[PDB]
Amino acid sequence: SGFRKMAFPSGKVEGCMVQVTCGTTTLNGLWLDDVVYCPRHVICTSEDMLNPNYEDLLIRKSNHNFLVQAGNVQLRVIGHSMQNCVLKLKVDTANPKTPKYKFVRIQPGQTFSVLACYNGSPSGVYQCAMRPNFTIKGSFLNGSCGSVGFNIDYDCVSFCYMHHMELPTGVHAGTDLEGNFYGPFVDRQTAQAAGTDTTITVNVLAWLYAAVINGDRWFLNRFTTTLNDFNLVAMKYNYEPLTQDHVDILGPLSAQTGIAVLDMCASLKELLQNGMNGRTILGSALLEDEFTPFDVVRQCSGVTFQ
Amino acid sequence: SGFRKMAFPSGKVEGCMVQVTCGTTTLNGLWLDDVVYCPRHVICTSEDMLNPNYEDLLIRKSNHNFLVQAGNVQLRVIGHSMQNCVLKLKVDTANPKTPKYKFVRIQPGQTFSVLACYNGSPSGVYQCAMRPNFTIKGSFLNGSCGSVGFNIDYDCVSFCYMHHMELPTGVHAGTDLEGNFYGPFVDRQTAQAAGTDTTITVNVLAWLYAAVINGDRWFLNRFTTTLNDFNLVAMKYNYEPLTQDHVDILGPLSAQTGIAVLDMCASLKELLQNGMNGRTILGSALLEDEFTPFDVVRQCSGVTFQ
Numbered sequence: 001s002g003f004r005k006m007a008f009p010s011g012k013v014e015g016c017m018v019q020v021t022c023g024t025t026t027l028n029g030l031w032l033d034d035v036v037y038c039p040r041h042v043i044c045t046s047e048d049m050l051n052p053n054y055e056d057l058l059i060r061k062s063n064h065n066f067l068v069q070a071g072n073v074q075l076r077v078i079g080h081s082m083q084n085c086v087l088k089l090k091v092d093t094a095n096p097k098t099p100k101y102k103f104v105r106i107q108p109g110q111t112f113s114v115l116a117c118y119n120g121s122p123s124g125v126y127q128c129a130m131r132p133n134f135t136i137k138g139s140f141l142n143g144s145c146g147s148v149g150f151n152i153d154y155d156c157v158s159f160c161y162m163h164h165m166e167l168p169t170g171v172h173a174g175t176d177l178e179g180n181f182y183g184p185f186v187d188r189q190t191a192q193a194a195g196t197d198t199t200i201t202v203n204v205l206a207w208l209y210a211a212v213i214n215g216d217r218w219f220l221n222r223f224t225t226t227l228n229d230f231n232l233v234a235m236k237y238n239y240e241p242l243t244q245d246h247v248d249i250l251g252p253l254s255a256q257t258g259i260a261v262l263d264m265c266a267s268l269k270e271l272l273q274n275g276m277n278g279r280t281i282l283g284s285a286l287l288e289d290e291f292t293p294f295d296v297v298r299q300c301s302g303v304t305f306q
Numbered sequence: 307s308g309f310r311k312m313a314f315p316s317g318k319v320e321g322c323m324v325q326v327t328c329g330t331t332t333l334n335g336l337w338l339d340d341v342v343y344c345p346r347h348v349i350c351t352s353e354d355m356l357n358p359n360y361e362d363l364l365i366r367k368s369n370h371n372f373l374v375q376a377g378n379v380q381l382r383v384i385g386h387s388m389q390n391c392v393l394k395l396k397v398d399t400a401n402p403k404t405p406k407y408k409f410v411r412i413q414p415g416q417t418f419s420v421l422a423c424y425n426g427s428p429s430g431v432y433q434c435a436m437r438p439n440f441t442i443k444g445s446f447l448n449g450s451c452g453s454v455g456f457n458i459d460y461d462c463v464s465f466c467y468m469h470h471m472e473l474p475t476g477v478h479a480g481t482d483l484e485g486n487f488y489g490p491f492v493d494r495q496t497a498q499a500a501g502t503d504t505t506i507t508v509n510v511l512a513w514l515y516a517a518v519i520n521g522d523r524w525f526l527n528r529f530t531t532t533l534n535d536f537n538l539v540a541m542k543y544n545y546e547p548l549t550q551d552h553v554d555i556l557g558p559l560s561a562q563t564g565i566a567v568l569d570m571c572a573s574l575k576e577l578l579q580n581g582m583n584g585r586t587i588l589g590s591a592l593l594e595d596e597f598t599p600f601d602v603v604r605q606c607s608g609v610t611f612q
């Protein structure tokens with residue numbers, strides 16, 4: 001048993017990670033086939049970044065200006081291209097280690113693994129959810145940009161995130177791999193802010209189910225709520241309204257534990273109202289909301305990858 | 307910006323995960339050069355494991371009684387030895403993906419990443435800590451055995467743990483890669499109890515520095531303490547004694563923050579006494595003790611691996 005925050009195994013993503021340098025700026029690219037995907041702000045300097053004309057600065061750039069590096073190997077760049085906020089560097093060699101892959105745009109509430117890299121080199125990996133306000137709570141230092149977020153369904157790598165900026169509050173913003181920002185954010189020096197976050201209710205119930213599967217059940221009660229009456233409470237505390245689709249999505253864990261959603265919902269209403277009364281759940285002193293239904297099923301039924 | 311429980315990238319260990327089957331029992335093997343290491347309870351039937359004679363059981367097995375699979379490819383076993391609680395299977399092929407590596411035996415309070423495997427397939431990666439009672443709070447289902455713990459020091463993978471058993475309350479025990487157990491446990495299906503866990507004081511302090519490095523300051527007080535005065539209070543909240551070497555080891559972080567260790571101790575001493583009274587630190591409502599001084603430097607100064 002046990003229950004941890006669990007990243008995907010990162011090896012298939014390490015294989016793709018390169019260093020990209022334009023003038024003074026060095027960060028990370030994602031090397032799939034003969035293309036290297038990196039944030040388009042690799043091109044500009046500390047100046048302009050007030051409000052930089054990427055179309056215009058790219059025209060001036062020479063392929064020679066991009067020093068791309070895979071360990072102890074300079075890759076010849078032979079073409080450059082811009083999609084939204086991502087630079088595409090055509091190079092004269094396809095990546096021997098390209099895995100099967102997809103570019104997907106995840107919905108808020110959905111979780112991925114992040115491989116934090118510096119100078120094309122991976123530092124560490126960690127799990128994190130796309131907040132409803134389209135920020136993520138990462139761990140990103142200068143040089144981290146171009147680091148990516150991904151899910152691994154079997155042998156297929158689904159790339160969902162490339163890193164761009166930090167925000168005030170120590171939260172992060174970035175793009176899908178077609179270079180569109182999650183949320184209303186922009187690749188400038190321009191001053192920017194998250195907007196009010198909400199608690200991902202569906203995920204809190206999932207984790208409660210996770211605790212029950214793992215013996216931690218002190219908070220189970222003989223009481224029941226309607227969906228409506230449950231939302232009337234949780235919504236007061238800035239929790240996502242819970243929907244029938246949410247309740248359906250919780251079907252499998254409801255069945256595995258034998259506890260109905262609207263029963264667990266009465267445990268959740270109580271924990272919000274009276275707090276945890278000095279107790280922990282899965283060794284947490286608050287209600288963790290960064291595990292999806294599927295994340296619990298994965299960890300707790302033990303589904304493997306390759 | 308941000309701080310996070312961060313696992314080492316698992317790429318280099320993934321290429322060493324094999325499946326080992328002996329009759330009706332399947333678990334994970336660690337394949338380094340021409341040797342596969344697994345737990346020795348792979349030669350047992352579910353009735354042998356109540357009180358087995360592993361020496362006797364191993365005498366009654368041939369090389370062919372070990373089906374070792376690396377992807378599709380089966381590996382021919384050409385020898386077998388038992389070192390303490392691990393099986394060493396000599397195979398006919400050297401692992402091309404074998405990293406530079408060594409075997410270490412870690413101290414309590416030291417952290418490492420776990421690559422949870424089922425059937426020689428890597429499933430998940432998570433950081434944890436050798437608890438002072440010689441257990442690990444991991445995430446392990448049936449089939450997980452042979453999954454290892456490890457650090458990366460630049461490019462050298464240090465293997466520190468192989469997984470063997472679950473103990474009461476959903477904590478875990480295993481061995482170093484010489485098959486010696488951490489703590490007083492045995493390779494047996496017997497009633498075994500872990501012993502009372504305490505909090506890793508030097509780690510909580512390391513994390514209080516992380517809080518302060520990431521702009522969490524509220525818990526700083528205008529007081530200092532003696533080591534002795536600190537231990538008197540910590541003893542009474544099940545905190546491991548803080549020694550002069552723990553203070554000395556905390557020096558670099560003290561110097562980075564300008565906050566004297568024994569002043570940080572005095573802030574911790576107040577937190578144990580008055581509790582946290584509903585406030586968080588790095589988004590935790592309890593004091594984290596699973597980051598080493600070196601982990602905090604690692605992540606805050608962003609050190610990288612290859």
Ligand SMILES: *[C@](O)(C(=O)NC)[C@H](C[C@@H]1CCNC1=O)NC(=O)[C@H](CC1CC1)n1cccc(NC(=O)OC(C)(C)C)c1=O
Pocket residue numbers: 025026027041140141142143144145146164165166167168169170172186187188189307
């Ligand atoms: C990225 O460009 C990089 O790694 N380049 C080498 C960095 C990564 C961030 C800096 C440290 N933490 C990070 O996550 N991003 C930026 O520097 C980013 C580039 C903009 C085009 C998007 N960026 C520029 C300017 C200002 C900020 N934000 C900022 O200063 O935020 C506060 C919280 C005020 C410090 C920013 O992210």
Ligand SMILES: *[C@](O)(C(=O)NC)[C@H](C[C@H]1CCNC1=O)NC(=O)[C@H](CC1CC1)n1cccc(NC(=O)OC(C)(C)C)c1=O
Pocket residue numbers: 001332333347355446447448449450451470471472473474475476478492493494495496
């Ligand atoms: C491991 O052997 C395996 O994966 N084999 C295929 C397995 C690890 C799993 C099982 C559930 N959680 C885990 O960590 N270990 C065992 O099953 C071990 C075998 C060890 C040689 C003795 N094992 C066997 C019997 C009983 C127990 N523990 C047990 O009964 O746990 C409680 C009830 C909590 C005391 C055990 O770990």
Ligand SMILES: [Cl-]
Pocket residue numbers: 283284285286589590591592
């Ligand atoms: Cl907590």
